[PDB]
Structure 1
Amino acid sequence: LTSCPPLWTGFNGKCFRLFHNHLNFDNAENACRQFGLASCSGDELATGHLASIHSAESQAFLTELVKTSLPDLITGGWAPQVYIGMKVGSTNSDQTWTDGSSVDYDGWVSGEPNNGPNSRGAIAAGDYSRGFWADVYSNNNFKYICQLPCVHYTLE
């Protein structure tokens, strides 16, 4: 059981919130960076980011976050699309996450990505894409998911 600030909700040690106002990818990442983690002394230690996803389970959860938060927006197609922190560079195999975590989970819908270079990933909650990711263009305006800074104690 995970501890998250009010209005956020937690799965495996990370804390998520779905934001409802449509922003393009950049400003969506930026919105997320307004959240942070500071030391009690006062120093800024880290920043929030667009959610990164690392497993079938993480992915199933964020799908449910979206599908139950937005049940009226669930179409038979791709829609709704919600941004996650996925960036796709020149080759389709230049996938990074904005938080700098590593792409160790593949949740693309069959055929995706395919609008590269410099596309961005989104949960596509429609009954077609069934939650799995689609890549879209950076200036598309959508709902987004943030994660608060991911952090653990080192006791070595």
Structure 2
Amino acid sequence: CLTSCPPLWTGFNGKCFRLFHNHLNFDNAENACRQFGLASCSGDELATGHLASIHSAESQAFLTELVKTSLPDLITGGWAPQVYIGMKVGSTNSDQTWTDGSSVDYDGWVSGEPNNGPNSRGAIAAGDYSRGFWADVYSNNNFKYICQLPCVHYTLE
């Protein structure tokens, strides 16, 4: 297998991703990703896209390479460019969730992050300070963002 994706999207480990270049706040970035859907052929919407979730060191490496190869002239000595992913930090730092409802089973935070709770949002920080690992930021920041299409698999049980 290679992952199969639609035009302009790119696949890694069974999921399809796309970096978007318009700058949106967190809630508007998530809603932008929700415009992509998965429908049954008889016409029922089953699922939406979401800001990307990340579940392994390899996935983190892939998304970092996606950002850095896509934005090479924007890479700074700082955190920038920061690109939203689907991470929400709630009332305490243990309250981490992904917008797609998947488990937080991978920790990609830059040392000292998250540090802007309660209710902050995660971003891949692809600048040289952070090398793609995540920063938390306030949700009103307007950033580029990565969407994932609905992640689904057949159950052959």
Aligned to 1:60, the other structure's residue is in SS state helix
What are the within-5 Å matches in structure 2 for residues 1-156 of structure 1? 1-156=2-157
Q: Give the aligned length.
A: 156
Shift of 1:116: 0.5
Cα drift, residue 70 of structure 1:
0.3
State the shift of 1:112 in Å. Answer: 0.1
Q: Secondary structure at the match of 2:100?
A: coil
Deviation string, structure 1 residues 24-49 (Cα, Å, up to 9, x no partner): 00000000000010011010000000
Percent of residue pairs identical: 100
Secondary structure (helix, strand or coil) at the match of 1:90 reads coil
What stretches of structure 1 move > 3 A for 4+ residues in a row? none
Structure 2: which 5+ residue stretches go unaligned?
none
TM-score, scaled to structure 1: 0.99
CA deviations over 1:74-104 (Å, ceiling 9, x no partner): 0011100000000000111100000000100
Work out the CA distance in 2 between the residues paired with 1:41 and 1:52: 29
Deviation at 1:135, TM superposition (A): 0.1
Q: C-alpha separation between the residues in 2 aligned to 1:46 and 1:78? A: 33
Distance 1:85 1:72 in 2: 25
What is the DSSP-based 3-state SS (H/G/I as helix, E as strand, rest coil) of the residue aligned with 1:27? helix
Residue 63 of structure 1 and its aligned partner are, at CA, apart by 0.1
Deviations 1:42-62 (A, max 9, x none): 100000000000000000000
SS where residue 30 of structure 1 aligns? helix
1:152 offset after TM fit, Å? 0.2
- Partner of 1:28: helix, strand, or coil? helix
CA-atom RMSD in angstroms: 0.3
TM-score, normalised via structure 2 length? 0.99
Report the 3-state secondary structure (helix = DSSP H, G, I; strand = E; otherwise coil) of the residue aligned with 2:58: helix
Q: Distance in 2 between matches of 1:144 and 1:91?
A: 24
TM-superposed deviation, 1:15: 0.2
**Structure 2: how far apart are the matches of 1:100 and 1:144?**
18
Distance in 2 separating the partners of 1:27 and 1:102: 22
C-alpha deviation, 1:129, in angstroms: 0.2
**Structure 1: gaps of 5 or more residues:** none
How far apart, CA to CA, are the structure 2 residues paired with 1:36 and 1:102? Answer: 21
3-state SS of 2:127 partner: coil
